[PDB]
Design a protein around this motif. Structure first.
Motif, short mmCIF file in Angstrom:
data_model
loop_
_atom_site.label_atom_id
_atom_site.label_comp_id
_atom_site.label_asym_id
_atom_site.label_seq_id
_atom_site.Cartn_x
_atom_site.Cartn_y
_atom_site.Cartn_z
N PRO A 221 0.69 -1.23 0.00
CA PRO A 221 -0.22 0.09 0.14
C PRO A 221 0.77 1.42 0.15
O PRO A 221 0.49 2.38 -0.63
CB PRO A 221 -0.84 -0.20 1.34
N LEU A 222 2.19 1.33 0.50
CA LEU A 222 2.96 2.36 0.90
C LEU A 222 3.30 2.95 -0.62
O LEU A 222 3.49 4.07 -0.91
CB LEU A 222 4.23 1.94 1.57
N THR A 223 3.52 1.80 -1.46
CA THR A 223 4.06 2.28 -2.91
C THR A 223 3.02 3.12 -3.64
O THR A 223 3.23 3.64 -4.56
CB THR A 223 4.55 1.08 -3.51
N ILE A 224 1.84 3.10 -3.14
CA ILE A 224 0.51 3.71 -3.99
C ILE A 224 0.59 5.18 -3.98
O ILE A 224 0.66 5.66 -2.97
CB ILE A 224 -0.89 2.91 -3.58
N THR A 225 0.58 5.70 -5.04
CA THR A 225 0.58 7.14 -4.88
C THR A 225 -0.71 7.62 -6.01
O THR A 225 -0.88 6.78 -7.01
CB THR A 225 1.83 7.89 -5.42
N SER A 226 -1.10 9.28 -6.04
CA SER A 226 -1.87 9.51 -6.97
C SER A 226 -1.53 11.01 -7.25
O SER A 226 -1.15 11.58 -6.39
CB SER A 226 -3.37 9.45 -6.19
N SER A 227 -1.75 11.41 -8.53
CA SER A 227 -1.91 12.91 -8.72
C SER A 227 -2.53 13.25 -9.94
O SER A 227 -2.60 12.90 -10.92
CB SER A 227 -0.10 12.95 -9.56
N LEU A 228 -3.47 14.15 -9.81
CA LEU A 228 -4.67 14.79 -10.51
C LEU A 228 -3.87 15.63 -11.46
O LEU A 228 -3.10 16.89 -11.18
CB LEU A 228 -5.62 15.48 -9.98
N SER A 229 -3.83 15.61 -12.81
CA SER A 229 -3.09 16.29 -13.68
C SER A 229 -4.22 17.57 -14.03
O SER A 229 -5.11 17.46 -13.81
CB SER A 229 -2.73 15.46 -15.02
N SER A 230 -3.57 18.68 -14.81
CA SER A 230 -4.25 19.69 -15.06
C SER A 230 -5.55 19.36 -16.25
O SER A 230 -6.52 20.10 -16.24
CB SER A 230 -3.40 20.71 -15.60
N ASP A 231 -5.02 18.41 -16.81
CA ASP A 231 -6.24 17.65 -17.85
C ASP A 231 -7.40 17.28 -17.07
O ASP A 231 -8.46 17.19 -17.83
CB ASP A 231 -5.71 16.76 -18.79
N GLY A 232 -7.22 17.10 -15.81
CA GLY A 232 -8.34 16.40 -15.05
C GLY A 232 -8.24 14.93 -15.12
O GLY A 232 -9.40 14.12 -14.88
N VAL A 233 -7.11 14.29 -15.31
CA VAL A 233 -6.86 12.87 -15.24
C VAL A 233 -6.12 12.55 -13.69
O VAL A 233 -5.03 12.92 -13.62
CB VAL A 233 -5.87 12.40 -16.44
N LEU A 234 -6.75 11.64 -13.15
CA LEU A 234 -6.49 11.39 -11.91
C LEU A 234 -5.40 9.93 -12.01
O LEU A 234 -5.92 8.92 -12.20
CB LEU A 234 -7.43 11.20 -10.86
N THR A 235 -4.05 10.23 -12.07
CA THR A 235 -3.26 8.79 -12.05
C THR A 235 -2.88 8.52 -10.94
O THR A 235 -2.23 8.86 -9.96
CB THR A 235 -1.98 9.40 -12.98
N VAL A 236 -3.29 7.19 -10.69
CA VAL A 236 -3.08 6.45 -9.36
C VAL A 236 -2.13 5.27 -9.65
O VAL A 236 -2.71 4.18 -9.89
CB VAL A 236 -4.46 5.82 -8.74
N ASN A 237 -0.89 5.63 -9.43
CA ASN A 237 0.02 4.44 -9.77
C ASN A 237 0.64 3.61 -8.46
O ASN A 237 1.04 4.27 -7.39
CB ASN A 237 1.33 5.20 -10.42
N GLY A 238 0.59 2.16 -8.59
CA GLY A 238 0.55 1.52 -7.33
C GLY A 238 1.51 0.40 -7.59
O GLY A 238 1.03 -0.76 -7.57
N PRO A 239 2.76 0.56 -7.66
CA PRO A 239 3.53 -0.82 -8.13
C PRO A 239 3.49 -1.81 -7.02
O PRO A 239 2.97 -1.44 -5.85
CB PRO A 239 4.96 0.04 -8.16
N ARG A 240 3.61 -3.19 -7.29
CA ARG A 240 3.52 -4.17 -6.37
C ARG A 240 4.77 -4.29 -5.39
O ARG A 240 5.77 -3.28 -5.66
CB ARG A 240 3.54 -5.45 -7.09
N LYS A 241 4.65 -4.89 -4.36
CA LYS A 241 5.91 -5.00 -3.27
C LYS A 241 7.08 -5.37 -3.88
O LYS A 241 7.33 -6.14 -4.72
CB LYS A 241 5.29 -6.11 -2.35
N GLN A 242 7.97 -4.73 -3.64
CA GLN A 242 9.28 -4.60 -3.85
C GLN A 242 9.39 -4.39 -5.42
O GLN A 242 10.25 -5.12 -6.29
CB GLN A 242 10.02 -5.97 -3.33
N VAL A 243 8.57 -3.39 -5.99
CA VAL A 243 8.79 -3.07 -7.30
C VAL A 243 8.93 -1.62 -7.26
O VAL A 243 9.97 -1.13 -8.15
CB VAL A 243 7.48 -3.38 -8.11
#
Lengths: 89, 89
Positions: B67-89
């Motif tokens: 869970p720690l690896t999981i992040t998110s960032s809304l772009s200005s285009d209005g796209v909410l990018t939620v990237n969450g690599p697997r454990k030790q990735v």
């Protein structure tokens, strides 16, 4: 983008972005003088997991609108066009 | 369109369409092994009437995701990018 509403002087047409949604999952609830819109993406659990998408909104028609005149039609592009001319328009 | 999820072999990145939504109205709820996403459009009553838009979804992360690896960032285009690599990735 997503806030796409056509506000005219004697009518209106909301263009809701519900691409990849089905007419069966889309609801238009014209009650009194308010419209409750719904649209849930068929729950399909997988790699991505359970889907609980609900791309909907709410539009309160002017008091001078005849509910009967209100119509809707989802396009193939996935745009739900809800046109509701005012009474005697 | 709206069903935009990047399903990789060791990671993922969901690109939720929430244009005209605010980061303040967007929520990412990483709990156990499931993510509950929210996004409600500031209610602004007018000609168009009360706004109750809730363009959100649900993504259940694989059990092998930290869970720690999981992040998110809304772009200005209005796209909410939620990237969450697997454990030790």
């Amino acid at each position: 983008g997503l806030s796409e509403m056509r506000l005219e002087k004697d009518r209106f047409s909301v263009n809701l972005d519900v691409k990849h949604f089905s007419p069966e999952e889309l609801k238009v609830k014209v009650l009194g003088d308010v419209i409750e819109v719904h649209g849930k993406h068929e729950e399909r659990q997988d790699e991505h997991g359970f889907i609980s998408r609900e791309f909907h909104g709410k539009y309160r028609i002017p008091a001078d609108v005849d509910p009967l005149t209100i119509t809707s039609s989802l396009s193939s592009d996935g745009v739900l066009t809800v046109n509701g001319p005012r009474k005697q328009v």
